[PDB]
């Protein structure tokens, strides 16, 4: 019954949680899980 | 438990004219019985299709999917003039092939098969439909002429044949249509820009695939329109963000953090750190939807936030189930769009 999605902001991004890598802004970012619901992307 | 085909056609007429109460509950019970009759032939056609796909591709790369059409979907279709006993797809199978040469090779094998299941209609959609949809549908009648005491006689099962790029287009159309709440199938009115985007990208998919070759002047004008529509709709960004948010909600640690009966929203946000970025996925109960929307507008107003999206968990769940390889498809479709826009 609720709206399936509300889009406010976004960019072209890809993430692979097996390789723990992310791709955005023409750069490669290393992924690390800080909490169950939180991640950091570092150079 | 034992309803005749006359009782089932009469039950379907009742739902069309808008029955209620005990009358509606009997009509739906007979239609559910008819729906269950398609299960054995659906699975039989699925193995028939898997056996024929393993013959055409010795690498075993053809992906085969199947689905029994939901009772609620059938009921909705009747009360919106398709006849229930004329419906070709209560059971539906699908083969996803590498290219058009593989597609035609699989069609020829299914057409030359000498079984009790007859192709009553071959639908050639290699030239895209007004929606932009392209591929091939085979309408089978299982146990068509050889029957006797067979309860599965003349059972209709649909077989869809598609290439990976035709499938990537269809997956992206379902993701946008679901998550953006644009009822493209429901109505033939509204969202002319999204309708035109999917039609032109569909035409360019069938050109690239070799399914339907367009002349050079048409390619040039379609690419110009595609660049225009894509900028207006922010297709590559919406498609990437939705896929990224869906990927994160499949994380194992995230799923234990969830309330056990989660059925609300997920708020996915990416922000700059004090080059470093923080990505969070915030679960919300269905009752806290107003709180979720308030938190979404705060992130939309923040200049440090690059991604801010709100997604209902039930919709994420059904798209992941319908499309196991949704991320391979949205990636391929986004790359295809970049090749035609940046020409
Ligand atoms: N032949 C098929 N084989 C496998 N999956 C299918 C087939 N037909 C539909 N599906 C998929 O099943 C899901 C449920 O779709 P649904 O039954 O509600 O509508 P539909 O069959 O695609 O279209 P329509 O209602 O217009 O006839 C969708 O993801 C759809 O792509
Ligand atoms: Mg269908
Ligand atoms: Na898929």
Author numbering:
A (entry chain B): 15 to 57
B (entry chain A): 13 to 92, 103 to 296, 304 to 372
Excerpt from the paper describing this PDB structure:
Activated CapRelSJ46 then pyrophosphorylates the 3′ end of transfer RNAs, which inhibits protein translation and restricts phage propagation. Here we discovered an additional protein trigger for CapRelSJ46 in the phage Bas11. This alternative trigger, Gp54Bas11, is a small protein of 66 amino acids with unknown function.
The interface is further stabilized by a polar network between D273, N275, K278 and S279 from CapRelSJ46 and Q47 and N50 from Gp54Bas11. Notably, binding of Gp54Bas11 to CapRelSJ46 involves a significant topological rearrangement. These interactions produce a ‘hybrid’ eight-stranded, antiparallel, twisted β-sheet comprising β-strands from both Gp54Bas11 and CapRelSJ46 that wraps around anchor-1 of CapRelSJ46.
